[PDB]
Amino acid sequence: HHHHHHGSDLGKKLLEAARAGRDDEVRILMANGADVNAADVVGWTPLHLAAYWGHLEIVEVLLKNGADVNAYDTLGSTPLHLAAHFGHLEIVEVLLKNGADVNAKDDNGITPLHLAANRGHLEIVEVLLKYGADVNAQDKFGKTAFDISINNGNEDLAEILQ
Amino acid sequence: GSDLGKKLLEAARAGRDDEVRILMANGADVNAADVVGWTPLHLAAYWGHLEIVEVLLKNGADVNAYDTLGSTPLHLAAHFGHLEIVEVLLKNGADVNAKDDNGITPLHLAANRGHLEIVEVLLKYGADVNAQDKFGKTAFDISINNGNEDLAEIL
Amino acid sequence: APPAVTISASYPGADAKTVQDTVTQVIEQNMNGIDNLMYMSSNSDSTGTVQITLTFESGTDADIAQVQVQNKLQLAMPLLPQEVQQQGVSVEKSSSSFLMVVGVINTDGTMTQEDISDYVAANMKDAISRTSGVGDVQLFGSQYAMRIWMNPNELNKFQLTPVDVITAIKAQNAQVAAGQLGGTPPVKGQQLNASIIAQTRLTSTEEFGKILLKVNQDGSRVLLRDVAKIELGGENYDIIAEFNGQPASGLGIKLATGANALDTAAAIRAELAKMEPFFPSGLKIVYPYDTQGVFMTMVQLPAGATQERTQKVLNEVTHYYLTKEKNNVESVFAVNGFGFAGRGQNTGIAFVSLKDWADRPGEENKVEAITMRATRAFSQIKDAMVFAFNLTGFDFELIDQAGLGHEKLTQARNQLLAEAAKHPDMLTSVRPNGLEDTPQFKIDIDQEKAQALGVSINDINTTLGAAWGGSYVNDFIDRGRVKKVYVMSEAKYRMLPDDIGDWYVRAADGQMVPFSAFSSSRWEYGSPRLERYNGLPSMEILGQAAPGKSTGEAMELMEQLASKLPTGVGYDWTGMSY
Amino acid sequence: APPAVTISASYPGADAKTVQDTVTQVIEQNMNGIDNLMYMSSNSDSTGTVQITLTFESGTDADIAQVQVQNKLQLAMPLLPQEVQQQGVSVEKSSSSFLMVVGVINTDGTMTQEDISDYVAANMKDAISRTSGVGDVQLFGSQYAMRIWMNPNELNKFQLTPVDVITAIKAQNAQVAAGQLGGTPPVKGQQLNASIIAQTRLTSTEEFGKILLKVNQDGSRVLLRDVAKIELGGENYDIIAEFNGQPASGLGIKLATGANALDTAAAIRAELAKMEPFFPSGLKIVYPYDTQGVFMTMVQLPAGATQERTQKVLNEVTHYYLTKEKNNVESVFAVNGFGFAGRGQNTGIAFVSLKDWADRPGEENKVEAITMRATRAFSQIKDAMVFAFNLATGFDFELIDQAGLGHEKLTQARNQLLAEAAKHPDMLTSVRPNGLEDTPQFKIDIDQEKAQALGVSINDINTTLGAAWGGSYVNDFIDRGRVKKVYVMSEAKYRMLPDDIGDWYVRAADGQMVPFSAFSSSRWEYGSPRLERYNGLPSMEILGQAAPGKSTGEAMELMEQLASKLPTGVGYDWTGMSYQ
C-alpha cells in the first residue's frame, strides 16, 4: 500500500489535477494511461489528495479506474483517514463502500474514528461505526474515541458512543 | 631608588634599545620594578625585545625575578612564543621549573599556546614534564584538552 | 512614485503562520497615527521572514514617513518574540529595484562561495550600507556564524540535550564585566589601578570545541566537540551566487528614495576603491549589473521546489546566455534563492550584462530583441516561470473581511479565478501573485504523556526547534568582528520523519526519553507565504485586459465577478490599479 | 490651542502610587532637552493608567515635537515594568477634544454591548486608527480577550495556584518555531522538504478549557476548566456605552494636530463605507456627534463612586433629554467609565445630537438655551458635578510640592489655600481643585520572616495576589484570525471582600498549601486615586474665576499673595489659559 514516488509526467499531472479538482483533466489523464496510484514525495496518491481537498467526483473516477482504496502515505495514513478528519461525509461513504479499511491505524495507532471523533464530525462517526469501526481501538497513548469525547467535552459524541 | 629606574622600565617596554644602553651607562637600577613587580627583563621578555634582554642580563639583571603573582621572565617569553628569548634566559640561568602562585610553569604556558619549539627547548633544559598546577593538570592534560595531537606526541 | 517604507524581520526556524501570528499581526496593529499612509501590505513566509510595505501618498516626505514608522515600531518591539527582536528589525526607504550589483569572485579559485560571501559580509557590506544614497543592501550569500552541528546519538549517550548545549555556550562563551583593582571609590593610600579581565568571547572553533558540558561519574570529561561538529558556516544557507559559472558573492544595492542614482553609484565605487588594496590574493570585484546595456531574468518555480531544481533551471538560463548569446552577453550573475519576490528555495534571478552597444550592431542585437528571444527560449522550461525583463495590466486584492481563514479564502480565490477563465474575451492571464499550499509535517506533543514522564514542554520545544530549525545562542568574535553562534542538528539527523525519533529529552528523574514516546505526527497542507492587505488576510491577483479591451472594462468585470463571492470576502485595487 | 503630545501607558491592576513611582517618574525624568516645550503635566491613576501631556509653543511642528518626545521616552522604556511595555506605550499628537463619534448598535438586539465592542475593536478600529489625520481613537468598550476566571477553592483542592495556571497557559497556548525536514544545508540528494508545525496558538474557549494542569498520582487529570470558568470577555470592564438607551459601542475620534477636519472626517466615512457591507446582521453605524447641532454633558462623581452610581446619574441625564427635550434632541450616546477627566469609574459623558436647525424654531430651542436649561435641571443632582455645554476667563493654578513634602502635606496646603480663597468672594469665584480626593485603600503587609520560614517565595505571593485581584495579561491567542490577549483573574465572587484574601493559597517549596492569612496582615488607610504632577513635581491643580468685572490679572495677583502664605516648600505656577 506504500506506492513508490515516480514523478513520471502523467502521474505528476494526475497528482496535480486530483488536488485542484479538475474532473475533466483527470478523466483524460486516466484514459491516456496515467498511473492511478502515482505517489508524491510524502506518499500521497491522487485518491489521498482528492479525499483531503473534498473532490467527490474525482474520488469516484479514481476508484472506478482501480485506485488503491487503502493506499498508505509515508506515516501510514489512508485516504479514509483524511476524509474522516476533514469532514467529507460523502467521500467517507464512497471509500467505505469501495472496501476502505475502516480500522486502519497510522504509525501513531490513530484510526479514522479517532480523527472524526476529535473534530466532532458526528455523521462520520456513525457511518464508520455502521461499517465495523472498533469503538474501543486505542492509539499509541491508550486513547479511545470515548476518551476523546470526554477530553473535548463533547457530550453529543459521548452519547452516540453510549 | 631611581627616577632612572622608571625610565628604564619604560624604555624596555617600548623597545628603545639605545635608550636602554644609555640609562644603564648612567647607573639605572637593572632590577627596578613597577607596581605589578615587573622588571625591565620581564617587560623585554613579554614584548619580545631580544637585544634588550641580552643587554639587561650582561648588566646583572636578575633572571629569576618574580612579579607579585609569582611569574618570571621565562614564563612570559614561553607563553608568548618568543623562542630566541627563551633560549637566552635558559642559557643565563632561568629556573625552567619555576612555578607561579597558581603552580603554572613555563612548560604549561608554552603547551597551552601550542608553542612546540619552546616546549622542546624547555624539555632539553630539564622541565619536569609531570609538573602539576593547582588543579592537578600537566602539559599533557593541556595538550589533550586543546586537541593538539602534535604536542601530545612530544610529551 | 508613491514612496514606500519597508519593515523586515526574521524568526529562525519559524513557519509562515508562526511569523504571521507572533510578528506580522502585532506590528500591523501598531502602525497607527502615522501620516499620509495610503495602504499597507505584508508577506509572512516559511523562510521565517516578514516584509511589511507601507505605501504613502504621492508627495509625502519619505524621511518623515520612515521616522514615523520607526517610532511606532520601536514602541511595538517589546510585543515581539525575543528571537525576532535579537535578529534586528530593519526599516528602509528605498526603491524596490536594484541600482547596481557588486560582484566578488576569486580569480585564483582559492576561496569557496561560502568564504567569499563571509569576506563580503565581514569587510565590505557595512561601509557600503553607510554610503549616502544606499537604501537597502542585499548580500548574495551569508556572513559566517560559529556553527555547532549537534549529533543526537552522542547527546543521548552522555544524557544531554540541545538545552544543555545552549546553556553551556551561554556560560562559557561569555564576556564578563569584572571591575577593577583599586577601583573607585578607592581606599586611601591605594597605589595600583588595573582592569580585571575575566571571561572573554571565544574566537575559534578550537575554543568552542573545548567547552565543558559535563564531568562524568568517574571524572572523564564531555567536551562540546564530543557531541557536535564545530565549524564556521553561514548564518543561513539559502542564497548561493555564481558569476559566469564560477563561485561568487556580492551586494545588491537599492537606491534610497529621492537620492541621486549617479552620485550614489560613484560614492559606492569610491568606497570599493578603498577596500581593494586589502583584499586577500585572488579576490576581485566585478560589475555585472550597472543601471540599455543590462537586463534581468526571473526564475520562479512552484512552492515546494528544492534548491537543487532551482539551480538546474538557472544553469539552463546561464548556459543559454553563455553559448547562444555569447556574442552579445558579457556576463551573467546568477543568484539561487533570492528573486524578484525576495527570498525562497524556489526562486532565482540572473543579472545579465551585455557587451558594448557598438559591438552589437543590428536591431536583432539590442536589448529588446535579446530579451524577447530569451523569453521565447525559456518558455518551454517545465514547471517554472522564466522570463527576461528590464527595471502594466491590473493588481487586485481579495480580502478576508469576516474571520474566514486561509482555507476559505483560498476557495474564494479559486472560485474567482475559475470565473475569470470563462471570459477570455475580456480578461487574460488572471493569476495569483503568491504561492500555493504545500505539505507540512504536523507534530503533536502529548501533554499528558510528557507530564507523566516528567519531561518539560520547554525542553521538548527547545530540543525540536534548535535541532530542526536552528537557534541563535549568542555572539562571538571572528577575526575581530562580532558575529553569531548557532546550534542546529547536523544535516544527516534532520532529513526524514524517522529522524524525529532519534532525538532524546532528559526527564526530571534523569531518564532519557525519545521523541517518539510523547509525540505523534501527520502530513497536512499549509501556506508557505501568507499575505495581508490593510491588516486583513489577503490574496493578490494579477491579470490584464484581453486584446482590444481597455483596462477599465477588465477591472469592471473583475468587480462584477467579485460581487458574487462567498459572504465575507471583499476586495480592493492596489499598486498600478489604485 | 497650543500643540500637545500625549504619552499614555497602562499597568493592569496598579494603584496610582505604583503607576507614578514605577512609570510616570521614570519617563518624566527624561523629558528635558526638548525644543519649544512650555510645560509638562501628568496624571497617574488607580485604573493603572498614566497620561503625560507635553505642551509646545504655538507654531511648533507637531511631527518634530512627537519625534523629540518619543526619543526621550526611549531612554525610559527598558526601565519600565514588563507589564507596561507589553500593553504598548503610545505617543500621540492630537487635539484633546473629539472631532466625531462613530456609534455602533445592533438593531436586531442579537449582540450585547460587549459583542459590539469586540466587533468594533476587531474589525473597525485599526483601519480608522491608520487613517491620515486621525490623532487618537478611543474605543467605548473593550476588545475581547480570552478570560480565565479562577476559583480559589478548586485551585486549593488540587494543590494549584495562579502561578501554575499562568505557567500552563504559556506552555500550552504557544506558537512554536520548529524548523523543517530537509532544510538547508541538506544532505545532498535530499528531495523532501517540509515545514514542521508543532504547537500553535489556541483559538477557542474549548481549547483553553482542556489545557492540562496536572496528572494526579492515581492517573486522573486536572484540566483548566476544572479550576476556572473560560469565556471571551473584555480586556477590561470599565467602559460601557448606550445609544438612546440601547446597547452600543463606538469610536471617539480626535483630530491630529494641524490636520484638516473636513478631509479627515470624509476619509473616516470612506473607510466606514468599506466595512459596512461585511457587518453581521443587525449591526448598524450611527452618528451621535459630528462637530452647532451638538453638545456634551459631563458627569463627575466623587472618587469612591461605583459604576452603578455613575449609571444612575447617567440615567437621569439621558431621561431628561429623552422626556423634557424630546422635541429638540435627536439622540444621546452616553458612556459610563470615561469622560473629560479620561478613564474612571466615577465619570461619564453624554454626546447629544440635536434635530435639524429648521425643526427647533425660537431662541429657547437653540443650543445655548438647551444647555442652560439642562445644566440648571442637573444642578440639583446630589454629589455630582453635571453640566451641559457646547465645546475663557478663568484661571488655571498649579500648587507644587517643591521640598519632598509628600501627598498628605500637599493636600493640607491645598485646603489652606482653598479656605483662604473662600474668604474673598469679591475677587474670586468657585475656587476648587480639578482632581480627586483620597479614598480608603486596603494595605496588605507581607511578612518576610514568615514567608521564609514556610518556604513561600515572594514572587509566588505577588503573582497570586496580583493575578487574582488585579488580572494578569498572560500571552496572546488567535480569535477568528486576529491576535488578541489572554487574561487570568479571580472570578468576581472570590475578590469582593477582605475576608476573601484568606481563601487564596500559595504552594510552598515543600508542596504544602499555605493560605494568605498565614504570612500577611492588613489594615485600612487612605490614599490617592489620582496623583498629579506638574513639570515633574507633585502638584494639585486649582481652577477658578475672577469675580464679576475684576480682571483675570487682579484675580491671579491675589492667588499669588494667598499662596505666599503657605507652608515652606509649597510653590505654585500658572498653566493653560493663565500661562500668558
From Swiss-Prot, chain D:
Periplasmic side: 1-291, 292-580
Compartmental location: Cell inner membrane
UniProt function note: AcrA-AcrB-AcrZ-TolC is a drug efflux protein complex with broad substrate specificity that uses the proton motive force to export substrates. (Microbial infection) Involved in contact-dependent growth inhibition (CDI), acts downstream of BamA, the receptor for CDI. Its role in CDI is independent of the AcrA-AcrB-TolC efflux pump complex.
Top-level lineage group: Bacteria
Family the entry assigns: Belongs to the resistance-nodulation-cell division (RND) (TC 2.A.6) family.
Induction: Positively regulated by MarA, Rob and SoxS transcriptional regulators (at protein level).
Any one GO molecular-function label of the UniProt entry: alkane transmembrane transporter activity
Designated name of the protein: Multidrug efflux pump subunit AcrB
